[PDB]
């Protein structure tokens, strides 16, 4: 068989099915391993919804929550995030 | 670094580092957040197979992070400050 997942989405390790955008964006499933930046070789980690951490690190653009600003010289907050 | 190849706890990490904390609470710190990386890696799989989807290991995850939070107080802004 094919194992691979359609287009809308991607086969995990042994041939599973993960949604595409479950893949390169921040949280560790297993399309190789952890489908994390070994499989999209992380065009500046993604250029979907990215905000920049600690002096230029990648986070999710929606982790603002709080309504102030983020990482820059600390993390974002760590505290309403998760 | 190969232990470490997430940022989640990078970030954490070195969050409470730069708050200026001593050895012992570093060491402790490290251990706890070790427990929460394992358990947060086992549950990602976890719920492809489907073995939680109500949501209980992460409310049991909840309760021990109380726990880390009422010990290292690393939160912020929670509502106000
Ligand atoms: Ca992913
Ligand atoms: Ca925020």
Redesign the pocket.
């Given at each position: 068989s094919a194992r691979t997942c359609p287009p809308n989405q991607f086969s995990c390790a042994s041939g599973r099915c993960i949604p595409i955008s479950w893949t390169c964006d921040l949280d560790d499933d297993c399309g190789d391993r952890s489908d994390e930046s070994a499989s999209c070789a992380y065009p500046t980690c993604f250029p979907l919804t990215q905000f920049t951490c600690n002096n230029g690190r990648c986070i999710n653009i929606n982790?603002?929550?709080?309504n102030?600003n983020?990482c820059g010289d600390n993390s974002?907050?760590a505290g309403?995030?998760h | 670094g190969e232990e470490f190849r997430m940022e989640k706890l990078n970030q954490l990490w070195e969050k409470a580092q730069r708050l200026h904390l001593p050895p012992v609470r570093l060491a402790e710190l490290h251990a706890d957040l070790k427990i929460q990386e394992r358990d947060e890696l086992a549950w990602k799989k976890l719920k492809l197979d489907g073995l939680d989807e109500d949501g209980e290991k992460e409310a049991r995850l909840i309760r021990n992070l109380n726990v880390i939070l009422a010990k290292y107080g690393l939160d912020g802004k929670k509502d106000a400050r």
């Open positions: 982790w603002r929550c709080d102030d983020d974002d907050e309403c995030s | -």
